[PDB]
Amino acid sequence: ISRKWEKKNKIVYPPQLPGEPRRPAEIYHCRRQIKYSKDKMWYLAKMIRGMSIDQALAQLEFNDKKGAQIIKEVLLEAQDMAVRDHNVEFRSNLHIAE
Amino acid sequence: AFVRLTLPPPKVVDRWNEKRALFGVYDNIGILGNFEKHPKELIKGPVWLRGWRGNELQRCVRKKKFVGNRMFIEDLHNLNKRISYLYKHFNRH
Amino acid sequence: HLACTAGIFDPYVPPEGDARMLTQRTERLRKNAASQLAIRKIREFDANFKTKDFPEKAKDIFIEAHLCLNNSDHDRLHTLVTEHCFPDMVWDLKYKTVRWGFVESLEPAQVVHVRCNMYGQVTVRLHTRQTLAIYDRFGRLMYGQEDVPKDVLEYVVFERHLMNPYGSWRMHAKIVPAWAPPKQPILKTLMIPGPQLKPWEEYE
Amino acid sequence: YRYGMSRPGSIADKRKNPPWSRRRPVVVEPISDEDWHLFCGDMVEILEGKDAGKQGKVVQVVRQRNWVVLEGLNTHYRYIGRTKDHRGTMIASEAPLLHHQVKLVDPVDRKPTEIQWRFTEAGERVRVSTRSGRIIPKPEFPRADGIVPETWTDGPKDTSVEDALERTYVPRLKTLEEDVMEAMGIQETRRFKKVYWY
Amino acid sequence: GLEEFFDDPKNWGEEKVKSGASWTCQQLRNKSNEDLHKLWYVLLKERNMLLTLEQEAKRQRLPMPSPERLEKVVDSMDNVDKVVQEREDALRLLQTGQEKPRPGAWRRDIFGRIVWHKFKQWPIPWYLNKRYNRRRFFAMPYVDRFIRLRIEKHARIEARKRSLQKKKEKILHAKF
Amino acid sequence: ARNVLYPLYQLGGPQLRVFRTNFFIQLVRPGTAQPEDTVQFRIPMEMTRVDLRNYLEQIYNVPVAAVRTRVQHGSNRRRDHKNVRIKKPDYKVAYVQLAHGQTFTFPDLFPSDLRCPGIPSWFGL
Amino acid sequence: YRAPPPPRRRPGPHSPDPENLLTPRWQLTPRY
Amino acid sequence: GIYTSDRKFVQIKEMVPEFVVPDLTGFKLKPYVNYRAPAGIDTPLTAKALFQETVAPAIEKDFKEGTFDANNLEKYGFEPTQEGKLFQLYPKNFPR
RNA sequence: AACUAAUCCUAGCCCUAGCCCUACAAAUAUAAUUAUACUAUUAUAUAAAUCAAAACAUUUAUAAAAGUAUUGGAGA
C-alpha cells in the first residue's frame, strides 16, 4: 500500500520572503478504505471538479447516492483541517481543485 | 520481474589463505616420491569413486556394490529402480 | 526515570515596576533569608553557584535553546532544557518555519529566587529585545515581524539535579509577571463559535 | 522468536513477534553461565553507546540478546501521558546495551577492568579483576515485590515466624497416613481379599 | 462454614490483600506427620475461598485481588505433598525395596516399543481373565521393518539436526 | 480426591477413607433464580453429589437438605488462529439446599493562549 | 604458512587380528 | 456403588469415601508464611536417611550389645509384607 | 511523490564425509485409549506383473581376466 497523498499534505514550503506573494493554500485529503466502487465514486468526483466549497456541499446534501454522503463527510473533514492546520481564514474561500 | 532496492554489503576474499596457497602441493608425490604412492591414492571422497570414474550407470552400479549391504532398505529399492531406468537409456538408446 | 519535576517549588512574586528597576539586588538580600538557605543547598553540591554570576550562564542557555528552534536542533535543545520544557518550546512550532534573533539585552540578567531526591529550581529575571517571525507551511508569514525588536521582560526558571554528580542546569520553566503586557496578536482573524443546539432546543 | 526489551509473552512482545512473523533471526553470540559476568545491581561502565564512559547500575538483563539495561543511561526521550487534552510529558527511556558495551567496575578504583571468574573460600563464584586483582562482591538488590523480609508484618492467614521454623517431626517407621491414624485413633479391622495384580 | 468460602468482609473491595510467603519444602519437612495432614486442609481451605472468590470475579468480569495469594497456597500445597510423598517413598523402599508404589513392569506392545506397563488388580486371575489374555502384549513379525524404519528415522533426525545447525552458522557469519 | 487411584472393593473389604482431599470447589452466585437456601457450587466433574454432601458436612460442617447437580457443556465452537477448535472446560454446577432451616445469600463481593494560538505558551516574545 | 608433512605409510609387517570383526576374510587366508 | 440386576443402583458404603478431616483448631500452620520467615535448606527424606534416623540407632546399640540376629530384623522395623495395614506402601491400596 | 502493487533474507533443504546401533494424573488392544471378571489369543507363501523382445509364448541385468567364452524364440 502507498500513502503518498498524505505525504503531499506534509510538504512544507520554504519561508516566503517579504517581497514574495502570499502562497495559495493547498490541502490534500483522502479516505483510503471505502466499501464502494471507485467508478461510481469517480462520477461524483468528476462533476464536483473545480467547484467551490459551498457549492459542492449544497449539491452533495441533496444527492441520493451513498458515495455522495461519504464525499460530504470527507469534504467537511478536509475543510475543518484546512482552517485548523492550513491557515484558511475564510471557510467559504475554498474550491475543489482536484 | 522486479529487482532488489538495496545494495549487498561489500565482501573481501583472501586469495593467499593456506588452502589456496597450498592447493596442489604434493601433487607430484609419485614422481618425487619414487612412485611409492600414486596421486590417485590422495583422493578423498565417496568410497566407490576414489581413484575411479565412469558414466552415470557405472557410478550408480559401483555405488550399489560398495555400500549395498550398508544402505537402507528403502534406498536400496529406490536405487534398484533408478538403475533400471539408467540401464535402459544408455544400453537401448 | 525523571531528571526534572514539573512545576516550581515556590512561585516568586514579582513586584510591579520591577522593569523600571542596587535596589532590586538588595531585595534578594532582604529575601535571602527565604532563599539563601536554598542557595547554600545548591552551593553544597556545587559550591560555585552565585546569584550574581548564574544569570550569564543561564542567559546563554535561554538564547541557545531559542536558536535551536530556527534550525530545529531537537537533540541540542534536549540538553539545554529539561524534559518538561522541551515539548512546550517545539510543540506549537510543528510544520512552521521561524526566524528568531536576540537583540541586545535591555538590562542585565539577575537571579531572583531559588528553591530545592533534591531538585533545585532557580528563577532568573530577563528583559531582552528579540526578533521573531513565523511562517506557514507555504511560507506565508503568520506571526511577528522579520526584523522588528520586541522588548519583553520575563522570569525564567532553570533546574538542576543536585544529587547526580553530572547534574547540570537545564532550562525548566518560565514565570510570567502579571504586569507584563499581552503578547503580540496573530495576523489572521479568529471566530468564537456560537452555541450549538438540537432542533427542539432554543437559543441561549 | 526475536527477544526484545519487552518481556516475552507481553502485548508488546506479541506485536513484536506475532505468530506469522518469520523475520531474519538476529544471531546472539552464546555466553556460558560461567562466562557471563553481568548481573542486576552491578555497577558497570559503558564502553560504547549514547552514555559511553558513564558508570551505571544494572536493573534488567536480557541474557538471550546479551543485553544489559542501565537505569538513566543510554537514554533517549519519549513522551508520557500523550492524550487528546495534553500533548504529553517528556521522560527518560532506556535502551539496551550489549554485554561487550559494558565492563565491570573495581570498587576501590572506578575503571572498566576486565575480570576473571574464580571461587572463594565459601565456594561462591566471584569476579576477580585481571589487573589489580580484587573481589567484586555480588551487589544487593531489593526483593521484586518490594517487601523487606524483616520489615514485613504478618497479615491474615500468615503463620508467625516462629511457627514456620518450629520442627515437630520425629523420625519413626510410620507414614503420614499411619501417624494420622494414631493421633485421631482411626482403626479398621476389615481386610481386602486376595487381588491378582496384572 | 459458608463464611469460610468467602473473604473477610473488610477485605471485600480492596485492591489487594496482604499475604506472606508460601511454605517452603524444608519447613514442611520439619513439621510432624500429623501436622502436615492438618496443614494440607488449612492450605486447601484458603485455596477454595480464593478459587471461590475468583469464580465470582469471573462472573462479575472483575479482577481477583492479590492473585499471587492463590499461587502461594498452591506452592505450599504442592510442597506438602512431596514432603508427605518423600516420607512414604522412603518407608516403602525400606520395607519392600520397590521404587514404585504400584506394581509394574516393562512390556512390549504390538508396535515393538518397550513401555512400562502398570499392573492392574483384578477380582479374578489373569489365566481365568480371558479379556486380559485377549489384551495384546506381543509384537507382530512385520514390526521388524518398522524397527528398521525407526532406526533410519532417528538417523535422519540427526542429519536434519546438522542441517539446522549449518543454517544457523551461516547467519552467525553474516551477523558477525 | 481427583486424578488418583481408589482401591478396588471386595466383600468384607475396608471402608474407603480419603484422609487428604484433592477436590476443590467454588461457590458461585446463582446464574438462574434459585431459593435462598439453595447454594450453587462449581465442582470437579468426577465428584459425586454424595461426596459433596460428605464434603460440606465434614470439612465445612454445613448441614445439607437436598442436592441437585448439572453438567454444563463447554462450547467448542471457538477456534484459534490456526482454525483449531478450542473447547471450554466442562464444569459441574451443584445446587445444594441447606438443612436446619438455614438460608444463604451470596455476599456482595467487590462492593497556549486562545487569542494567540500557534505560539507556545512558553514563548514570552 | 608451512606445508604439512608429506604423507608417510606405516612400514613393516602388520599381522591382522583374526578375532576382529572389521578385518576382511582375505587378509586372514593362508595365502595372505 | 454396584448396580444389581434390573439396573438398580445399590450404594456400597465401603466404596463411598469418608472424608477424614483434621482438627484445625489451635493449629498454627496457615495458608501462608511470613516473608519474615527464612526458608530452610531442603533435606528430602529418603530410604537411607529414614534408615539412618530410625533403624540405624537400634541396630547400632544392639550390635554393640551383641543382641543382633537375622531373626530379629523385623524387630528393627522390617515388614515382610504390607498386607493387613490400612495403608499399604506396595501395592498402594489407599487413597491420598 | 498516484492508487492497485512492488521491494528483502532466512524458514529450511540437498549431496557426500563422519558416524551405525547395543538410550503429568488418568485411560488403553474389550468397541484400544471405557477405573474390576464377559470372549481366549496371532502375522507371513517363488515376489509377481508392468516392462524388454517394436505384438506375444521360453526368455528380459537391477581390482584384472571381461562385457570375452559360454548361455539365449542364438533375439531382446
C120 beta partners: C160
Closest CA to D26 of D67, D80, D84, D87: D67
Looking at the complex, report in whole angstroms how far the Cα of residue C25 sits from the nearest Cα belonging to chain F: 23
Which chains would you list as touching A if contact means 3+ CB atom pairs under 8 Å?
Answer: C
Alpha-carbon distance G16 to G25, whole Å?
10
Residue D144 in contact with partner chain E when CB distance is under 8 A: no
Strand partners, F98: F64
**Nucleotides, chain I, CB distance < 7 Å:** 1-21, 24-30, 35-44, 52, 61-63, 76
Whether the CB-CB separation of C185 and C141 falls below 8 Å is answered with no
Closest-CA residue of H relative to D194 is: H83
User: Which member of B18, B21, B37 has the closest CB to residue G7?
Assistant: B37
Q: C135: how many CB neighbours lie within 10 A of its CB?
A: 23
The three cell numbers of residue D35 are 562466562
Q: What is the bridge-based pairing of β-strands D158-159 and H32-33? A: parallel
In this structure, how many other beta carbons lie within 10 angstroms of the beta carbon of residue D57? Answer: 16
CB–CB of E86 and H44 under 8 A?
Answer: yes
Query: CA–CA separation, C133 vs C139, rounded Å?
Result: 11
All three cell numbers of D64? 538471550
d(CA B23, CA B25): 6
* Cα–Cα dist F53/F62, whole Å: 9
* Closest Cα in chain D, distance from residue F21 (Å): 13
Q: Which residues contact A73 (CB under 8 A, 6 or more apart)?
A: none
Whether the Cβ atoms of residue C138 and residue A13 lie closer than 8 Å to each other: yes
Strand nucleotide closest to residue B79 (CA to C1')? I62
Q: What angle do CA C16, C17, C20 make, to 5 degrees?
A: 160
Distances in whole angstroms, Cα of residue E122 to Cα of each of D69, D161, E1, H12, H84: 63, 50, 41, 18, 19
Q: To the nearest whole angstrom, how far is the Cα of F117 from the nearest Cα of chain C?
A: 7
Cell of residue C173, nine digits: 520553566
d(CA C159, CA D137): 36
Tell me the HSE value of A43 on the side-chain side, using a 13 A CA sphere. 9
Distance CA C159, CA C168 (A): 8
In the chain, the amino acid numbered H77 is G
C-alpha cell of residue E152: 533410519
In order of D54, D70, D72, D117, E173, the CA distances from D67 in angstroms are: 17, 10, 15, 20, 20
Partner-chain contact A87 C142, CB within 8 Å: yes
Q: How far apart are CA B15 and CA F118, in angstroms?
A: 65
Q: Assess contact for H32 and F33: CB atoms under 8 A.
A: no
DSSP string, chain C: --SS-SS-SS---PPTTTTT--THHHHHHHHHHHHHHHHHHHHHHSS---TTTHHHHHHHHHHHHHHHHHHT-HHHHHHHB-TTHHHHHHHTTTT-EEEEEEEEESS--EEEEEE---EEEEEEEEEEEEEEEEE-TTS-EEEE-TT--EEEEEEEEEEEESSSTT---EEEEEEPPTTSPPPPPPSS----PPPP--SSS---
Q: State the pairing for strand pair C110-115/C119-135.
A: antiparallel
**Alpha-carbon gap, residue C169 to C45, rounded angstroms:** 13
Q: Which of C163, C119, C152 is nearest to C10 (CA)?
A: C119
Q: Are the beta carbons of D38 and D47 closer than 8 angstroms?
A: no
| Cell matching residue D48 | 560504547
Measured between its terminal Cα atoms, the distance across chain E in Å is: 67
Amino acid at C97: T
Torsion angle in degrees (nearest 10) through CA of D84, D85, D90, D91: -80
Which chain E residues contact residue D24 at CB under 8 A?
171
d(CA F58, CA H19): 7
Q: Is D26 helix (H, G, I), strand (E, B) or coil?
A: coil
What is d(CA F13, CA F10) in angstroms, rounded to the nearest whole number?
A: 5
* Orientation angle between helical segments A53-61 and A66-85, nearest 10 degrees: 150
Distance CA D144, CA D137 (A): 20
- Centre a 10 Å sphere on the Cβ of residue H58 and count the other Cβ atoms it contains: 14
E12 vs D80: CA distance, rounded Å: 33
Residue with cell string 536417611: H49
Residue A17, all three cell numbers: 520572503
CA distance C190 to C169: 39
Strand ranges across the sheet with D126-129: D115-118, D126-129, D135-136
If DSSP states are collapsed to H, E and C, what string results for E4-38? HHCCCCCCCCCCCCCCCECCCHHHHHHCCHHHHHH
Q: Which DSSP string corresponds to chain F?
A: --SSPPPPP-TTPPPPEESS-----EEE--SS---TTEEEEEE-TT--HHHHHHHHHHHS---EEEEEEEEEPPP---B-TT--B-PPPPEEEEEEEESTT------------SSSTTS-TT---
CB hemisphere CA count around D31 (13 angstroms): 15
Residue C176, judged by CB atoms within 10 A of its CB (0-12, 13-18, 19+), counts as: middle
For residue C56, report the phi and psi dihedrals to the nearest 5 degrees.
-60, -50
Spell out which residues of chain A touch residue C99, defining contact as CB-CB under 8 Å: 15
Tally Cβ neighbours within 10 Å of residue E152.
Answer: 14
C-alpha grid cell, residue A58: 449544497
Does chain F touch chain E (at least 3 C-beta pairs within 8 Å)?
Answer: yes
Tell me which protein residue sits closest to nucleotide I51, measuring alpha carbon to C1'. B84
In angstroms, what is the C-alpha Rg of chain B?
Answer: 22
* DSSP per position, E50-66: HHHHHHHHHHHT-PPSS
Three-state DSSP state, D104 = strand
Residue E144 CA distance to nucleotide I39 C1' (Å): 30
Helices B56-67, B73-92: crossing angle, 10 deg rounding: 150
Q: List beta partners, residue F67.
A: F96
- In sequence order, which residues have a C-beta less than 8 Å from that of residue E104 and are 6 or more positions away? E116, E117, E118, E119
HSE on the CB side for H50, CA within 13 Å?
Answer: 22
| Terminal Cα-to-Cα distance of chain A (whole angstroms) | 22
Task: Give the single-character DSSP code of H52.
Answer: I
- Partners of F18 on chain H (C-beta within 8 Å) are 17-20, 95-96
E144 touches chain B (CB under 8 A): no
Tell whether D50 is within 8 A of chain C (Cβ): no
